Amino acid sequence: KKCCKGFCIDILKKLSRTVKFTYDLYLVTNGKHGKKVNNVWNGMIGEVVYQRAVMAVGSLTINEERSEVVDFSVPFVETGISVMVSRSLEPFSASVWVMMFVMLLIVSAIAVFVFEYFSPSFTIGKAIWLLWGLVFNNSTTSKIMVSVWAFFAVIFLASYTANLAAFMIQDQVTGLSDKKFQRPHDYSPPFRFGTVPNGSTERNIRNNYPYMHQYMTKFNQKGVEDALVSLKTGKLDAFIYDAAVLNYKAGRDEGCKLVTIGSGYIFATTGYGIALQKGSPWKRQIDLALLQFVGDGEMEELETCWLTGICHN
Amino acid sequence: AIWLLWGLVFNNSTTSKIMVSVWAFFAVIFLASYTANLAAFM
Amino acid sequence: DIDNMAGVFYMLAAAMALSLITFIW
Amino acid sequence: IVTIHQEPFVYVKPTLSDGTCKEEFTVNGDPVKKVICTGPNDTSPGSPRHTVPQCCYGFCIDLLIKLARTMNFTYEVHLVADGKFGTQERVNNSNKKEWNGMMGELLSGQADMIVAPLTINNERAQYIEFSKPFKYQGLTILVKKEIPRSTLDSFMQPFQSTLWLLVGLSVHVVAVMLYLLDRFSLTLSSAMWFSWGVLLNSGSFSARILGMVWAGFAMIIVASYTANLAAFLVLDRPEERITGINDPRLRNPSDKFIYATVKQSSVDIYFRRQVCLSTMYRHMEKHNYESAAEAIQAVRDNKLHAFIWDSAVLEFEASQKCDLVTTGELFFRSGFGIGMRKDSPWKQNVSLSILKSHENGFMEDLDKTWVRYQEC
Amino acid sequence: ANLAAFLVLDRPEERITGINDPRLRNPSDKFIYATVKQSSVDIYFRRQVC
Ligand SMILES: C[C@@H](NCc1cc(Br)cc2[nH]c(=O)c(=O)[nH]c12)P(=O)(O)O
Ligand SMILES: *[C@@H]1O[C@H](CO)[C@@H](O)[C@H](O)[C@H]1NC(C)=O
Ligand SMILES: *[C@@H]1O[C@H](CO)[C@@H](O)[C@H](O)[C@H]1NC(C)=O
Ligand SMILES: *[C@@H]1O[C@H](CO)[C@@H](O)[C@H](O)[C@H]1NC(C)=O
């Protein structure tokens, strides 16, 4: 006998406030969540179908194989298919790039013109050299009175150096809809994706990319920690698994070296739900309790301390 | 010598002078450090 | 800034002192 | 089937003189599916309402077409007479809970299936069953994004306008004292010319120290001129985009940054139960506007700094007009669904079909071809 | 520009303002902190599931 802790435990405790029924929990023994193998269910489904467990609470992924066999409540935790990837002039000045660069030319031209007009040394050669050696460090009476341009010169130099010093203060695949997943031979470094067998993701990618699963099976894992250490050591280029756990581990990672790819790029935004029994007298109350908790302000406190992370931009 | 030393390090102002003009590296480094410190210590 | 006036006053005081010294020399 | 005119999802347009609407094409050249729409001619009340045939199309109608093709359905889409999703109103004998809008029509038997953008709430789900959501979008923060520009527009020094006069009098007195010291063991303007040429970048013992001290005076002027510009540039950032409800800026609303809801949106009800949002309610109650269109118009007119509404509308408005950009990661997320009666036998089949379509990638294609248009 | 950038990033670290500091919420190998053994501190931390 042990005491189970976690987000699901808090959800069950909140549900028991309205349901007011005693809940006894026990861990699984048939490996992972399982799947339909030889028309025999396994894991949570294998214990719910055979009346060994009326309610299934956990990180079960909603898929096409669960809805028709068992009935689950309204999903409350967002999930889906996510990809984990490790972290990898005009913008500095003259953004328009057409105003100041011609203003300098026209002001130099008018300076040369007025220098020529001041004849009553050489206008063609000396004026340009003095103008370009006066504004920049690199290099009689009429020159002194026109030397007032040094104020504008030093102001421009200060603005340029300040802009250069202040404008230096500081995704790749964009979802499964890219050719990178479907064409691993178009790049010299072979792609090494990761997945956990006996899950809802392998069958989901079988139902949509039957040809890709053959290459996907070449790299198998045993747990999420194996994928994490592989990504940290660079053994696997990318990892595909449940979106919620990937987001949590990206927000709780050390060194901010792991991030997801934007938002809304999930292949199939699904939920978790609670797989109940067919015809069980709890579907008309569990869903109402979950919706009341979601929409009345009984989830944000759990989300802040159980799901929110760091390394945001 | 004093005039050239003080007019070489700062903007405001034969063979032997050229070979000792290598001090301009330290001069520009000091100027850059000074302006960076003055801009970043406020 | 307030420190700029103090610095320029300190520099001007030293300049005036040096000018007085080189004049009395 | 009854549907509400929702611009991001339902494109209700009048038909032509022949009774049907013109056929357009998308960016990919595929024909745009359309269904004959039935509803009142005038949405506003107090008008001679006529059930003229409209023509509505969009993402939800495309999903309905897919469901009809895959589930043996023959449907005639309608429009909401009230124009609202449906809540509790007050009528004679106010102690009776009577529904309006889509929910009231469904409970009265006028409609049998609701394929539109109706939020899933516990109060709605108490009497009307909901199916599996199509997509999950929670309300976010909408602010106006403007092209960055320097805020250092000033003349005669940043803050000490007397600095120019001070340096002018300094360069005058140093020149006159240089002229005075010249007559010691160069008459009209040479001293001033040299002072200008040594202060700016242009072409006995007293002269040396004078030049040293004046060079030192000149160095600090340009150093300060660079330093103040650098400081202004590094503080030139106007504001930082709100990352969510946990942003400290939102937790203490002020007159410099005002944001509020409309009136009584599922948003106001949610904020009522949040006892920790007392500071929010002490300021948002004085900035509520009658309609979301008026609120977004005020936001565009630089009246309200931020606006809070469901993402399904704010994201569409941001996509249509680049003057507004949606901010915030997510908070108080919800999903859509299908409104069906408690005794409807289509619940399981509809849920299975929606799950199959979601897993087949149809939802992503529909979002690409109906929600995200001309990304800014 | 590079010297200015280095100077403006020259700050080693920012002092922790309390238990709500995001740095403490995600301890790493670069910043290690721990209690002694079973101080009224460990007992308090035991009941904090977060
Ligand atoms: C509470 C807010 N509307 C939310 C909402 C936004 C959108 Br978009 C679609 C909806 N479809 C519904 O069935 C519903 O009940 N709500 C919906 P409002 O009434 O205060 O403007
Ligand atoms: C997956 O299930 C198979 C049985 O179909 C089993 O042999 C294998 O060990 C399981 N793998 C894991 C990682 O649980
Ligand atoms: C029902 O749908 C099937 C498609 O599988 C079609 O062959 C059949 O004619 C349809 N029946 C009716 C009554 O619409
Ligand atoms: C639900 O779909 C199945 C086929 O998947 C069909 O046999 C059944 O008649 C449908 N139910 C209803 C109420 O139409």
The closest of A188, A206, A189 to A197, measured between CA atoms, is A206
Q: Is the C-beta atom of D349 inside 6 A of ligand 4?
A: yes
Q: How far, in Å, from the CA of D61 to the mean position of ligand 3?
A: 20
**DSSP code at position A180:** H
For A305, name the nearest residue in chain E, comparing CA atoms only. Answer: E50
CA-CA distance, D34 to D244, in Å (whole number)?
Answer: 38
Asked whether A172 and A191 are in contact (CB, 8 A), the reply is: no
CA-CA distance, D197 to D213, in Å (whole number)?
Answer: 15
Cβ burial of D299 (10 Å; 0-12, 13-18, 19+) is buried
Asked whether A277 and A103 are in contact (CB, 8 A), the reply is: no
Set of chain C residues whose Cβ sits within 8 Å of the Cβ of D162:
none
Q: Which residue precedes each gap in chain A (C to N above 2.5 Å)?
A: 88, 120, 139, 170
Q: Do E5 and A168 touch (CB under 8 A)?
A: yes
The closest of D249, D259, D250 to D314, measured between CA atoms, is D259
DSSP line for D141-195: EEEE----------SSSSS-THHHHHHHHHHHHHHHHHHHHHS----SSHHHHHH
- The 3-state secondary structure of A296-312 reads HCCCHHHHHHHCCCCCC
Give the number of C-alpha atoms closer than 13 A to the C-alpha of residue D23, restricted to the C-beta side.
5
Q: Do B10 and D219 touch (CB under 8 A)?
A: yes
The closest of D61, D65, D70 to D353, measured between CA atoms, is D70
Structure tokens at D290: 């009658």
Q: Do B11 and D201 touch (CB under 8 A)?
A: yes
For ligand 4, atom 14, the nearest C-alpha belongs to: D346
Structure tokens at D201: 């970048």
Q: How far, in Å, from the CA of A50 to the mean position of ligand 2?
A: 20
Pocket test for ligand 2, best of A29, A36, A45, A198 (most atoms within 8 A of CB): A198
Looking at the DSSP bridge assignments, the partners of residue D339 are D114, D130
D174: left (phi over 0), alpha (psi -120 to 50) or beta: alpha
Write the CB contacts of D371 (distance below 8 Å, at least 6 apart in sequence): D8, D59, D315, D316, D319
CA-CA distance, A265 to A251, in Å (whole number)?
Answer: 17
The closest of D355, D309, D352, D360 to D117, measured between CA atoms, is D309
**DSSP code at position A22:** -
Distance of residue B28 Cα from the nearest chain A Cα, in angstroms? 11
Give helix D205-234 / helix B2-9 axis angle, nearest 10°: 10
Q: Which residue precedes each gap in chain B (C to N above 2.5 Å)?
A: 13
For B2, name the nearest residue in chain D, comparing CA atoms only. Answer: D208
The closest of D179, D213, D181 to C20, measured between CA atoms, is D181
* Angle (CA) D266 D268 D274, round 5°: 110
Q: Do A310 and E26 touch (CB under 8 A)?
A: yes
Distances (CA, A) of D121 to A38, A216, A275, D127, D344: 40, 40, 20, 11, 19
Asked whether D134 and D336 are in contact (CB, 8 A), the reply is: yes
A66 in a labelled binding site: yes
Numbered residues of the known binding site of D for glycine: 117, 119, 124, 266, 310
The closest of A77, A37, A42 to A57, measured between CA atoms, is A77
The closest of D126, D362, D61, D65 to A74, measured between CA atoms, is D126
Looking at the DSSP bridge assignments, the partners of residue A85 are A259
Q: How far, in Å, from the CA of A155 to the mean position of ligand 4?
A: 79
Distance of residue E49 Cα from the nearest chain A Cα, in angstroms? 8
Asked whether D38 and D81 are in contact (CB, 8 A), the reply is: no
Write the CB contacts of A244 (distance below 8 Å, at least 6 apart in sequence): A59, A77, A78, A79, A272, A307
- Helix, strand, coil shares of chain D, percent, nearest 5, are 40, 15, 45
Reduced to 3 states (helix: H, G, I; strand: E, B; else coil), residue A71 is: coil
Task: Specify the DSSP element, H or E, that contains D199.
Answer: helix D190-199
CA-CA distance, D221 to A154, in Å (whole number)?
Answer: 11
Q: How far, in Å, from the CA of A31 to the mean position of ligand 2?
A: 7
CA-CA distance, C5 to C11, in Å (whole number)?
Answer: 10
CA A142 to chain centre: 64
Give the number of C-alpha atoms closer than 13 A to the C-alpha of residue A77, restricted to the C-beta side.
24
CB neighbourhood size of D135 (10 A): 18
Reduced to 3 states (helix: H, G, I; strand: E, B; else coil), residue B23 is: helix
Cβ burial of A13 (10 Å; 0-12, 13-18, 19+) is exposed
**DSSP code at position D32:** P
Give the number of C-alpha atoms closer than 13 A to the C-alpha of residue D250, restricted to the C-beta side.
21
Q: What is the dihedral of CA D109, D111, D117, D123, to 10 degrees?
A: 10
CA-CA distance, A177 to E8, in Å (whole number)?
Answer: 41
CA-CA distance, A283 to B1, in Å (whole number)?
Answer: 96
Give helix D205-234 / helix A149-166 axis angle, nearest 10°: 50
Asked whether A239 and A280 are in contact (CB, 8 A), the reply is: no
Query: What's at A7, amino acid-wise?
Result: F
The dihedral of CA D46, D49, D54, D57: what is its sign?
A: positive
Structure tokens at D98: 């009577």
Residue that the structure tokens 């030293």 belong to:
C14
The b-or-e profile of D187-213 (16+ CB within 10 A means b, else e) is eeeebbbbbbbbbbbbeeebeebbbbb
CA-CA distance, A311 to A255, in Å (whole number)?
Answer: 9
CA-CA distance, D34 to D14, in Å (whole number)?
Answer: 12
Cβ burial of A26 (10 Å; 0-12, 13-18, 19+) is exposed
Write the CB contacts of D350 (distance below 8 Å, at least 6 apart in sequence): D67, D71, D131, D132, D338, D340
Chains that touch E (3 or more CB pairs under 8 A): A, B
Q: How far, in Å, from the CA of D304 to the mean position of ligand 3?
A: 54
Query: What are the two backbone dihedrals, phi and then psi, of residue D317, each rounded to the nearest 5 degrees?
Result: -65, -40
For ligand 2, atom 1, the nearest C-alpha belongs to: A198
CA-CA distance, D322 to D145, in Å (whole number)?
Answer: 8
Structure tokens at A61: 């992924």
Q: Which residue precedes each gap in chain C (C to N above 2.5 Å)?
A: none
CA-CA distance, D349 to D360, in Å (whole number)?
Answer: 16
Asked whether D224 and C19 are in contact (CB, 8 A), the reply is: no
DSSP line for D212-241: HHHHHHHHHHHHHHHHHHHHHHHT------
Task: Specify the DSSP element, H or E, that contains D340.
Answer: strand D337-340
Asked whether D85 and D4 are in contact (CB, 8 A), the reply is: yes
The closest of D115, D16, D3, D10 to D57, measured between CA atoms, is D10
Asked whether A183 and D229 are in contact (CB, 8 A), the reply is: no
A35: left (phi over 0), alpha (psi -120 to 50) or beta: beta
Task: Specify the DSSP element, H or E, that contains D114.
Answer: strand D114-116
Give me the residues of E, 4-43, that contact A with CB < 8 A: 4-5, 8, 22, 25-26, 28-30
Structure tokens at E22: 């995001």
D347 and chain A: CB distance < 8 Å anywhere? Answer: no
Pocket test for ligand 1, best of D59, D113, D118 (most atoms within 8 A of CB): D118
Distance of residue B36 Cα from the nearest chain A Cα, in angstroms? 9
Structure tokens at D304: 């309200």
Pocket test for ligand 1, best of D85, D139, D288 (most atoms within 8 A of CB): D85
Task: Specify the DSSP element, H or E, that contains B18.
Answer: helix B15-20
Reduced to 3 states (helix: H, G, I; strand: E, B; else coil), residue D75 is: coil
The closest of A127, A74, A135 to A100, measured between CA atoms, is A135
Asked whether B2 and D191 are in contact (CB, 8 A), the reply is: no
For ligand 4, atom 5, the nearest C-alpha belongs to: D349
Q: What is the dihedral of CA A97, A103, A108, A109, to 10 degrees?
A: 110
CA-CA distance, D193 to D40, in Å (whole number)?
Answer: 85
Query: What are the two backbone dihedrals, phi and then psi, of residue D323, each rounded to the nearest 5 degrees?
Result: -65, -20
Strands D11-14 and D53-57: antiparallel
Distance of residue E23 Cα from the nearest chain A Cα, in angstroms? 9
CA-CA distance, A291 to A76, in Å (whole number)?
Answer: 8
The runs of H, that is alpha helices, within chain A are 7-19, 43-48, 100-117, 126-135, 141-146, 149-166, 179-182, 200-208, 210-216, 224-233, 243-251, 283-296, 300-306
Write the CB contacts of A44 (distance below 8 Å, at least 6 apart in sequence): A28, A33, A34, A53, A56, A58, A60, A275
Reduced to 3 states (helix: H, G, I; strand: E, B; else coil), residue D306 is: strand
Picking from B2, B8, B12 by the largest number of D CB atoms within 10 A of its own CB, the best residue to mutate is: B12
Q: Is the C-beta atom of A222 inside 6 A of ligand 2?
A: yes
CA-CA distance, E48 to E35, in Å (whole number)?
Answer: 15
Write the CB contacts of D340 (distance below 8 Å, at least 6 apart in sequence): D106, D112, D113, D114, D128, D129, D130, D131, D346, D347, D350
Set of chain B residues whose Cβ sits within 8 Å of the Cβ of D212:
6
Resolution in A: 3.8
**DSSP code at position D357:** H
Query: What are the two backbone dihedrals, phi and then psi, of residue D78, each rounded to the nearest 5 degrees?
Result: -120, 180
Distance of residue D174 Cα from the nearest chain C Cα, in angstroms? 10
Looking at the DSSP bridge assignments, the partners of residue A239 are A84
Asked whether D338 and D350 are in contact (CB, 8 A), the reply is: yes
CA-CA distance, D191 to D182, in Å (whole number)?
Answer: 10
Write the CB contacts of A57 (distance below 8 Å, at least 6 apart in sequence): A8, A11, A12, A25, A274
Asked whether A154 and D222 are in contact (CB, 8 A), the reply is: yes
Asked whether D218 and D199 are in contact (CB, 8 A), the reply is: yes
Asked whether A192 and A219 are in contact (CB, 8 A), the reply is: yes
Chains D and C touch (3+ CB pairs under 8 A): yes
Asked whether D22 and D98 are in contact (CB, 8 A), the reply is: no
CA-CA distance, D131 to D336, in Å (whole number)?
Answer: 9
Strands D259-260 and D306-309: parallel
D177 and chain B: CB distance < 8 Å anywhere? Answer: no
Question: Quick one: which atom of ligand 2 is closest to the CA of A196?
Answer: 13
DSSP line for A148-170: THHHHHHHHHHHHHHHHHHS---
Query: What are the two backbone dihedrals, phi and then psi, of residue D270, each rounded to the nearest 5 degrees?
Result: -65, -40
CB neighbourhood size of B42 (10 A): 12
For ligand 2, atom 8, the nearest C-alpha belongs to: A198
CA-CA distance, C16 to D213, in Å (whole number)?
Answer: 10
Give the number of C-alpha atoms closer than 13 A to the C-alpha of residue D91, restricted to the C-beta side.
8
A200 in a labelled binding site: yes
The dihedral of CA A262, A265, A266, A271: what is its sign?
A: positive
CA-CA distance, D344 to D314, in Å (whole number)?
Answer: 33
A59 in a labelled binding site: yes
Q: How far, in Å, from the CA of A51 to the mean position of ligand 4?
A: 25
Q: What is the dihedral of CA D180, D185, D186, D190, to 10 degrees?
A: -70
- A292-298, Cβ contacts within 8 angstroms, sequence gap of 24 or more: A292/A18, A292/D122, A293/A14, A293/A76, A294/A76, A294/D122, A294/D334, A295/D121, A295/D122, A295/D266, A295/D270, A295/D334, A296/D122, A296/D270, A296/D273, A297/D270, A297/D273, A297/D274, A298/A14
Q: How far, in Å, from the CA of A205 to the mean position of ligand 3?
A: 30
For D205, name the nearest residue in chain C, comparing CA atoms only. Answer: C22
CA-CA distance, D65 to D31, in Å (whole number)?
Answer: 14
Distance of residue D135 Cα from the nearest chain C Cα, in angstroms? 57
CA-CA distance, D12 to D58, in Å (whole number)?
Answer: 9
Ligand nearest to the CA of D261: 1
Structure tokens at A10: 């808090």
Set of chain C residues whose Cβ sits within 8 Å of the Cβ of D184:
23
Q: Do B39 and D230 touch (CB under 8 A)?
A: yes
Asked whether A34 and A202 are in contact (CB, 8 A), the reply is: no
Numbered residues of the known binding site of E for glycine: 40
Cβ burial of D322 (10 Å; 0-12, 13-18, 19+) is exposed
Structure tokens at D20: 């049907």
Q: How far, in Å, from the CA of D186 to the mean position of ligand 1?
A: 85
Task: Specify the DSSP element, H or E, that contains D59.
Answer: helix D59-71
Reduced to 3 states (helix: H, G, I; strand: E, B; else coil), residue A247 is: helix
Q: How was this structure determined?
A: cryo-EM
**DSSP code at position D275:** G
